[PDB]
Every structure is written in C-alpha cells, then in structure tokens.
C-alpha cells in the first residue's frame with residue numbers, strides 16, 4: 001500500500017551518461033554502442049544562440065573538436081553528423097554498459113523518468129509527463145542539457161526525451177533521440193510561448209483508481225455520467241477530452257476496483273465542480289495527472 | 305529552474321540488491337562486500353508472525369537454508385547472524401559492485417531515496433522523509449521488504465533504511481542497517497499505532513525558499529515574527545517547533561534569497577492561518593515538508 005511518484009531505477013541510464021565539450025560549452029551526452037547523442041546546441045557560442053545557423057556552425061567543427069569524456073576516460077571521436085537537433089558522435093569504443101534500448105517518440109500525457117545530469121554526472125531522477133502542450137515541468141539548471149527521459153520494460157530502456165532548453169516561463173522543451181522537438185519548439189534563444197497546459201484526464205482517472213485501491217475513497221459519489229456530459233465539464237476545466245480509447249485503457253482498473261469508468265468520471269466531475277473542500281487524495285490537495293493507467297497497474301501490482 | 309521531488313540515481317544500489325529465500329518466504333537483501341543484509345522476518349512462516357521468537361526460529365536454520373540469488377547466480381552462504389531485526393548472511397563472494405557506503409541512522413525530518421524491489425529486482429525509486437513519528441509514507445507491496453533507503457554524497461552511499469512492515473494504517477516502518485527500528489515499532493503482526501504525524505517545519509521553510517528562487521513568490525508578505533510567536537502557530541497546526549539550529553540550517557537559503565528566516569516564518573504563519581486560497585506553490589496545493597534545506601541547496605545548485 002501507499003502510492004508514490006515513482007521513477008524507473010536509473011542505473012541502466014547512469015552507465016550511458018557522458019560529458020560532451022565543444023569549444024567552451026559542456027553538456028551531457030548519451031553513449032549507446034559506438035554513438036554519443038547530444039543536443040546540437042553544444043556547437044553554439046553564447047552569442048550564436050539568437051539565430052544559430054547549425055549547418056554553417058558545424059562546417060567549422062572537426063571530430064577532434066568534440067571532447068567526449070566518460071567518467072575520467074576520453075573517447076576518440078571518429079565521426080560526427082547532425083540528425084535534426086541532435087549530434088551523433090561516432091566513437092571508436094562501444095559503451096560496454098549499453099543496455100537493451102529503443103528510441104521512442106512518446107504521446108502527450110505519457111510519463112517517463114528523467115536522469116538529470118551535469119558534466120555527464122547524474123544528480124537525480126524524477127518522474128515527468130509530456131504535457132499536452134509538449135512541454136515538461138522539469139528541474140534543469142545550466143549544464144543539464146543532454147539529460148534524457150526514458151521508460152524501462154523489464155531490461156529494455158526506451159529513450160523518449162533529450163533535454164534542450166528552458167522556456168522564458170521556466171518550463172522545459174526537448175527532442176526525441178532522433179532530435180525532433182516535442183511541440184513547435186526550436187533550439188534558439190527567442191520568444192517561445194507554450195500553449196494551454198491542459199490536464200491529462202485519463203491520468204487523473206487512473207490516479208483516482210490508485211486512490212480507491214489504497215483506501216482514499218471519500219470522493220466516490222452516487223452519480224454516473226456519459227462521455228459527452230463528462231467532456232462538457234472537462235472542456236470548462238481545461239481537461240483533455242476523454243475518448244473510448246481512454247475508457248478502454250482504464251478497463252483493468254475498472255475491473256480490479258469494480259468502479260465503472262463513467263462512475264469514476266462522475267466522481268471527477270463533482271471534484272472539478274466542488275473542489276477538494278480542504279481534503280487530500282493520496283496526500284495531494286489537487287488532482288494528479290502524471291500517472292498513466294499503466295503506471296497505476298505497474299505500481300499497484302509490483303512489476304520489476 | 306523548476307523544482308521536483310528528486311531521488312538519488314539508484315544505480316549504485318541496484319547492483320547491491322539480491323533475493324533472499326528462507327523456507328517459502330522471499331524478500332530483498334542488500335549485498336555489500338561478502339555480507340547480505342535482510343529483515344530477520346525472512347525466517348518467519350505466515351503463522352509465526354503473531355509473536356515470533358526469532359532466537360528460537362533461527363536455531364532451526366542453517367547456512368544452506370538461506371537461498372541468496374543475485375540476478376540468476378546463487379551465492380554460497382558460509383555464515384549467518386541476527387543483529388537486532390536484520391540477518392547478516394556471510395557469503396563466499398564480495399559483491400563486485402559494492403559502492404563506497406556507510407550505515408547511518410537518520411534523524412526524523414531527514415529525507416532519503418527508496419529503491420523499491422521485488423525478488424531482488426528493482427521496480428522504482430522515490431524520495432521519502434523519516435516522519436517525526438518514525439514512519440515513512442512509502443509504496444510497498446508484498447515482497448518489497450528488504451528494500452533500502454539511502455543518500456549519496458558524491459560516490460559514497462549512506463544506507464539509512466531497510467523496509468520491514470506496513471502498519472494497519474498503510475504507513476511503513478523499518479530499521480537502519482544495524483536492524484534497529486525507527487520509532488517504537490517491532491517486527492511482529494500486532495496493533496502498532498503511529499503517533500501524531502507532525503509537519504517538518506524547517507523542510508516547509510526550505511521549500512518556500514526553493515519556491516521564491518523558482519519564481520513562486522505570491523505568498524511573501526509584509527510581516528515578520530519571532531521564534532516564540534511562530535512556534536505558538538506551529539504548535540496549533542501540528543508543525544514541529546522551530547529552533548535556532550533550524551534557522552542556522554536555513555542560513556544559505558536566507559543569504560541566497562535575501563529573505564530573513566523569521567520573515568519566511570511569518571509568510572508560513574499566514575499560509576497556515578489563511579490557507580492557499582486555491583493557489584499553488586511549485587505545483588502543490590499544500591505545504592511540502594519532504595525537502596530538507598540541503599535538498600533545496602543541492603537541487604538549486606546542480607550538485608552531482
């Protein structure tokens with residue numbers, strides 16, 4: 001019992017973290033096999049950052065200009081290329097700690113673990129969600145760029161995020177490991193406003209199921225609702241519309257708890273309309289939306 | 305920028321996690337050098353658990369009755385002893401992944417990372433606090449016992465917690481790595497009520513500093529207070545009394561932010577008396593008390 005914002009164990013990812021220095025800029029790189037992946041803004045000089053021409057900047061750069069340090073051993077760089085907003089640095093040595101991995105571009109509302117790193121050294125791990133507006137609410141200081149988001153399925157690390165920038169509003173933007181930004185964000189120092197940060201309805205509902213399972217039931221009501229009635233309320237409260245796919249994904253929590261998805265929807269509706277009235281749910285005074293149905297099932301069943 | 309409930313990277317601890325089976329009971333063990341540490345309740349049969357005589361139960365047990373599995377390789381057990389509520393199993397092989405470590409018994413209000421494990425396999429990592437009542441609010445299913453709490457200082461893992469039991473109220477109790485319970489808890493299936501769960505005042509104040517640093521300032525007021533005036537308010541709201549030691553420990557946050565500790569105290573007092581009025585602080589609708597001053601400094605400076 002008990003429910004926690006849990007991250008994946010970070011060990012498999014810790015052994016992939018390196019430091020990349022180009023000129024005077026140091027950030028984090030991810031070493032998988034004989035490739036080190038990092039943000040292409042490593043080639044930027046603080047003054048290039050207004051509108052960098054990365055193609056023009058990269059012409060000036062040779063294999064030997066990319067200093068790759070894995071702990072206190074230097075990697076020989078034998079090739080470099082730009083794929084979208086990441087650099088791939090071919091090194092002469094395959095990372096001996098390369099776990100089984102995949103690159104996956106995640107959907108908004110999906111959750112992952114961030115290993116926040118500085119100079120290729122891990123500082124901490126936390127659980128995040130890709131916000132509906134393709135930002136994440138992270139914890140990233142100067143030098144944290146190249147820190148990666150991942151999921152683990154038994155022994156396979158799915159890399160989904162590389163950290164690139166902080167928006168003027170102090171939310172975070174980044175790419176998948178093919179270097180495509182989540183959202184409309186570009187790797188340049190300019191006005192980038194995020195869109196409306198909507199609540200991930202299916203994740204709130206999953207977290208309400210997690211609460212019921214863990215004994216927090218005060219919010220279960222005598223009401224039900226329909227997908228259309230519910231979504232009228234979602235719309236008003238900047239909640240993502242709920243689909244039958246969402247309902248289906250909640251099926252195992254529904255089944256375990258014997259609370260119909262639409263009944264739980266009706267409990268959420270009352271919570272949105274009436275607030276918490278100074279009560280808490282799983283020690284939170286607001287509706288948590290950074291647990292997926294899969295996260296609830298995983299944590300409420302002991303998957304390793 | 306951004307502030308997250310961050311855990312230590314868990315890799316150093318992942319390589320210490322083993323499975324311990326005695327009879328039909330399996331739980332987690334911690335392998336450091338040639339010793340595996342686990343809860344002594346591994347020797348209990350579901351029926352011993354009402355009032356086990358661990359000395360009498362342990363007489364029936366031989367080195368070969370303790371099955372220690374590290375991944376899918378078995379460790380030879382060459383000695384066993386009970387220290388308080390843990391078993392130490394001497395094995396014939398030193399863990400080759402033994403990090404630098406210490407056993408430390410933490411103070412209430414102190415924070416640590418839990419690597420939650422099942423059958424010696426890590427499932428997740430989260431950040432906890434030793435509550436003032438010597439419980440932790442964890443996430444532990446059947447088979448999670450022997451999961452450990454730790455801090456990391458550069459390269460040295462300080463082990464502070466081994467998980468032992470869930471109280472009837474679904475909070476968690478456990479020992480240090482010398483097998484002494486935090487609090488008055490015993491490893492037996494009986495009525496164990498925790499005391500009053502007070503709020504860790506110094507940690508709330510640290511988190512208010514973290515908020516100001518990160519741009520969340522709405523709660524900064526025109527008031528100050530005294531240690532004695534403040535503690536009158538703390539007492540009423542089941543907040544731990546604040547001492548000059550607490551004030552001293554907040555000194556660097558005071559200095560960085562230029563907000564006197566007692567002024568921040570006066571902001572907290574108003575928050576306790578007036579509530580949040582539906583506002584949030586670092587995305588929380590209640591006062592967070594599971595960041596220490598050291599955690600705020602660490603996260604707000606990039607320590608690895």
Ligand SMILES: COC(=O)c1ccc(S(N)(=O)=O)cc1
Pocket residue numbers: 041044049164165166167168186187188189190191192
């Ligand atoms: C490569 O440069 C960038 O990608 C970048 C973007 C945004 C900002 S910020 N915090 O001024 O908005 C700073 C740097």
Ligand SMILES: COC(=O)c1ccc(S(N)(=O)=O)cc1
Pocket residue numbers: 345348353468469470471472490491492493494495496
């Ligand atoms: C070794 O046995 C125990 O330490 C123990 C303590 C408490 C409980 S519980 N959840 O019934 O209160 C169950 C088992």
